[PDB]
Design a protein around this nucleic acid. Structure first.
Lengths: 88, 95, 52, 54, 114
RNA sequence: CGAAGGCGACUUUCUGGUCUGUAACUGACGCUGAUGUGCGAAAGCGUGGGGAUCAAACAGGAUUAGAUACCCUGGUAGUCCACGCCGUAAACGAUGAGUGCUAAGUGUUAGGGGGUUUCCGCCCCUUAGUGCUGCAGCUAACGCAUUAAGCACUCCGCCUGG
């Protein structure tokens, strides 16, 4: 699916835009779960190996979209990086 | 998801009681926590195709699982060849 | 695995031949012994359904 | 799917005690039917229906 | 003690050698490719057992093998007429067991049949 | 399919990603290029194996009017896998990677829409490609081309004597 296990378990706090499919502001801080969760997506039988660069240019995707919001408005990414629990 | 479809045959140089001591597990214990041997998929006298167990006919009781969790297939992949009515297994993760 | 009787043995030229080749998985027999190169067979190794 | 061990009912024409598969054109199939023929039968065909070699 | 003997034939493309043995491993004797003047692996000729293996079999006279059952693990030209020394004195060639192994396959390789 | 070197036993994995049918959707959020990314095959490469196979050396043979060589078993290592790789191949696309076409065609893997459903097949649309040709263009010609050795918008690097 739209991975409602996480993609729409995190929307409970991160559905900041409706038709939240696609509005990149929705997928704000979903990068936090895939640290060791994708290591278990791989390590069972191993090599989702380039998923490292995958997740890390996904952090880059956050740089692509959350800064697109910062340009849409600074207070947006401030609310998402100052008052948010993933700070700075 | 480690869904293990375990090709197990019984050591068919056995009696129905020796089958019973190990296939009483493969209906209820293999129904533990989404393991779901879907029913008594332990058919009678089949034909041993490649000859194992030094017995010339096949009593093919086999454990069949279509799930995602698949709890209690390891509980006889560990009892695979130690058994007197299992021989082998199949190590298969199937999400 | 083969028992053929009722045949002459100067005529065993014809009796020793006909239980050899029949197998669709003649390769998936061979598995773990002696493994080779398709080099000149790369003319014919773009081939059906192996993994592509 | 990955047809299971007894799931060779309409396919034991393809299965064998001793090692005979029908490749793609042998059944006239495309790259999903031939693919189950060559991969999904194998859970029934290989593990305790084919002695590969010693 | 008659009707007991196998001509277990270790014949490749060359090396037409055959043990005139029991049905299982006890190995009476033979006219093999090291027996009728040859050595083996150029004896792609039956004269290991073209005529002079039933010389051995009837000098024995204990087999009485109506079933002599040449057991092969490869090809060979003189092997189809390595059984002519089971037809010479006439020990009733009855089986041709030309097979290579299919037990199963020990480990990160040792090795066995192709 | 991979960053490539390249990627091959299969039950399985992640099916990651290709992949086409849907694509459910905020508003330029990309190619090449400071960053940085990794390795690249072998010859050779830092441990047990390794002379088990193969194998240089040696033996030993000799063509016809010529070896120890084409010849190689014993065999020198080496070969080889459980701990370190080089930045080299005709890795050649001699042809760098973004937006899109160049009459187009072409049968086809995938995934689809389907009619007919067949007896899982005939017919139409289909694209990443798959090939085949083939319009324009291309250079001297080799020859390239709806998938360049063309055409109009991106970057890269190269060199205008060697």
């Amino acid at each position: 699916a739209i991975s409602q296990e996480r993609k729409n378990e995190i929307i409970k706090e991160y559905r900041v835009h409706e038709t939240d499919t696609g509005s990149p502001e929705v997928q704000i801080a979903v990068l936090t779960a895939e640290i060791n969760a994708v290591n278990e997506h791989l390590r069972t039988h191993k090599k989702d190996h380039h998923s490292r660069r995958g997740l890390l240019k996904m952090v880059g995707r956050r740089r692509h979209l959350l800064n697109y919001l910062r340009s849409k408005d600074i207070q947006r990414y401030r609310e998402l990086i100052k008052s948010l629990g993933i700070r700075r | 998801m480690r869904t293990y479809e375990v090709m197990y045959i019984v050591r068919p140089n056995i009696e129905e009681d020796a089958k019973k001591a190990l296939v009483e597990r493969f209906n209820g214990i293999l129904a533990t926590e989404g393991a779901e041997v879907l029913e008594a998929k332990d058919w009678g006298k089949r034909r041993l195709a490649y000859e194992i167990n030094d017995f010339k006919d096949g009593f093919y009781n086999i454990v069949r699982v279509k799930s995602d969790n698949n709890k209690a297939t390891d509980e006889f992949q560990r009892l695979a060849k130690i058994s007197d009515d299992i021989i082998r297994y199949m190590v298969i993760r199937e999400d | 695995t083969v028992v053929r009787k009722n045949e002459s043995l100067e005529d065993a030229l014809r009796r020793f031949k006909r239980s050899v080749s029949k197998s669709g998985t003649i390769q998936e027999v061979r598995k773990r012994e002696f493994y080779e190169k398709p080099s000149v067979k790369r003319k014919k190794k773009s081939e059906a359904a192996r993994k592509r | 799917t990955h047809i299971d061990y007894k799931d060779t009912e309409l396919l034991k024409r393809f299965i064998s005690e001793r090692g005979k598969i029908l490749p793609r054109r042998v059944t006239g199939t495309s790259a999903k039917y031939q693919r189950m023929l060559t991969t999904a039968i194998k859970r029934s065909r290989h593990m305790a229906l084919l002695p590969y070699v010693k | 003690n008659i009707e007991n003997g196998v001509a277990h034939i270790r014949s490749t493309f060359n090396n037409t050698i055959v043990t005139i043995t029991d049905e299982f491993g006890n190995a009476l004797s033979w006219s093999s490719a090291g027996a009728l003047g040859f050595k083996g692996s150029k004896k792609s000729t039956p004269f290991a057992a073209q005529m002079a293996s039933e010389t051995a079999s009837k000098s024995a006279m204990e087999h009485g093998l109506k079933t002599v059952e040449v057991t092969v693990k490869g090809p060979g030209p003189g092997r189809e007429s390595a059984i002519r020394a089971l037809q010479s004195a006439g020990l009733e060639v009855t089986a041709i067991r030309d097979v290579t192994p299919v037990p199963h396959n020990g480990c990160r390789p040792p090795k066995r049949r192709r």
